[PDB]
Amino acid sequence: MREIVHIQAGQCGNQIGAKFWEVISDEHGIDPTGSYHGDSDLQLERINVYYNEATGNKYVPRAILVDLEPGTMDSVRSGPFGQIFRPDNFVFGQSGAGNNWAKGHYTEGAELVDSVLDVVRKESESCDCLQGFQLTHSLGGGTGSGMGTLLISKIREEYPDRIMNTFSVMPSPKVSDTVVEPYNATLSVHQLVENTDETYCIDNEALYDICFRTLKLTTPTYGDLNHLVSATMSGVTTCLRFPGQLNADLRKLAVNMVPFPRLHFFMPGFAPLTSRGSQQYRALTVPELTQQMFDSKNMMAACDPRHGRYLTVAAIFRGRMSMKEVDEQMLNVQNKNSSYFVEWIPNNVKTAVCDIPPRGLKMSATFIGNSTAIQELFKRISEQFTAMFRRKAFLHWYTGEGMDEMEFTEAESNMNDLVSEYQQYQDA
Amino acid sequence: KREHEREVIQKAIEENNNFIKMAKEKLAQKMESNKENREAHLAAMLERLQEKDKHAEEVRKNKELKEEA
C-alpha cells in the first residue's frame, strides 16, 4: 500500500487528468520539468504515492495517457505540464471511438488495449508496494467510457487483489447534446458496479448548475467545469497525498466508505466554491466550511442528500485552523441533522485535517459521502436510457459493432437493481 | 467476459463480411438476368426481320411463276 498508478482515458479523461496533475504538482512543489522547488517538507513525504523518481531527482508522474485519437493528447503534451509526463506513457490510436461504447469496448479499443496494459505492467513493476489504480474518464463518450471499463475489467484480471478507484464524469443534457450518451453511461455503470471498489460520481449536471447558478457564469466552459473537478480531485486525494491518520490509503478508505460491495458510488462536495475569476480574499470560518460542504449547492453529484441517508462520510479540512473547532462543527452537523445519517452504522462520519491548504485558498473543506440519494443520479440516466431503448433507437450504431439488444437489457436491468439496492438501505 | 469480447468482434466481422457477400451476389444475379433479357429482346427483333426476309422471297418467288406462263 504505497504507489498508485493513474490512468486517464478519452477527451474528458485526459483533460481533467491533466488539470489534476497541474494542481497537485503545484501543491507538492513540482515544476513542469519535474524538479522540486517548494518550502515545506510535507510536500515530499508521500510524493512517492503519485510520482516516480529519476536521475537528477526529477519527479515523473505515475500516469498513463490513453486515447483512440491523437487530438487531446497532442494538446496535453503541448499543455502547461505537457513535458512532465513520461513520453513512452502516451498510448494513442488514430481511428477514434465516435462517442460509441461498442467501438471503445469491443472493436476499436480492443485493438489498442494490449499496448496500454504493457505500460501499466511496466509501472506496476517499478512499485515497491502497489495499492491500486485511479482512473479518470467520462461515461458519456466512447473511449473513456467504453475502453476505460475494458481496461478496468482487464486490469482487475491481472491485479484482482488491488484496489480499483475511479473519477467518473456522469453525462447530462445540460452539457452535451449527443443523444447516445445515456446508452454509453448505462453500459459503463454495469461495469463499475462489478469491477470498482471506489467511484467518485462527478456529475456534469451539477458542475454546470454550480457554474451557472452559484458562480454566476452565463456561458460556462469546460475549463470552468474542470476547475471544480480539479479542486474536488485535489481534496478527495489529500488524505492520500500528505501525512494523515484517516483514509490514508485506498483500501482503508474503501473499508470505511463501502458497507456493501456494490454501493461504492461516492457523492463529492467542496467548499468554498471558486471560479478562476473569483477573488476569494476573505477566507471562510470553520462553521462556514461545514454548513456549505453539506449543502446541496456544493455537491458535485446533483443529488439532494435530504432525499436519502448517509451510509458513510469522510470530511477533509485543509489549511491552518482550530482543529478543536473543526470537531465541534463536525459533531454539530451530525447532531443537528442526525435523521439523515443511518443509525445502524454508528459514528459513520470521520474527519481529517491537513495543514497545507489548496492553491489560492487559506481554508478549504472537501466532502465524500456515500449517500443513498446517489440513486437519483442513476435514476436520471435510467430514464434517458429507456426513453430511447423502448423504441430501440440508435441501436444500429452498436449492433453494427457486434453488440446485441440483450446486452443492453442486462445493463439496464443491473442498474435498476443498483437503484433498488440503494433504496433498500435508505429505509433501514 | 473475455470469451464474450471475442464473440462480439467476430460477430461484427461475420456480419460486415456477409453484407459484402450478399451485395456481391445480388449484384451478379441482376447483372446476368439483365444480359439475358436484353439479348433475348434483340434476338426476337432480329427474328421478326428475318422472317420478313423470307416472306420477301416468297413474293419474289411467287411473281417468278406468274411471269412465266
Ligand SMILES: Nc1nc2c(ncn2[C@@H]2O[C@H](COP(=O)(O)OP(=O)(O)O)[C@@H](O)[C@H]2O)c(=O)[nH]1
Ligand atoms: N467536465 C468535462 N466533461 C467533458 C470534457 N470533455 C468531454 N466531456 C464530457 O464527456 C462526454 C463525452 O465524452 P468524451 O470524453 O468527449 O468522449 P471520449 O473521447 O470517447 O472519451 C460528454 O458528456 C461531455 O460533457 C471535459 O473536458 N470536461
Ligand SMILES: [Mg+2]
Ligand atoms: Mg469530441
Ligand SMILES: [Mg+2]
Ligand atoms: Mg482498425
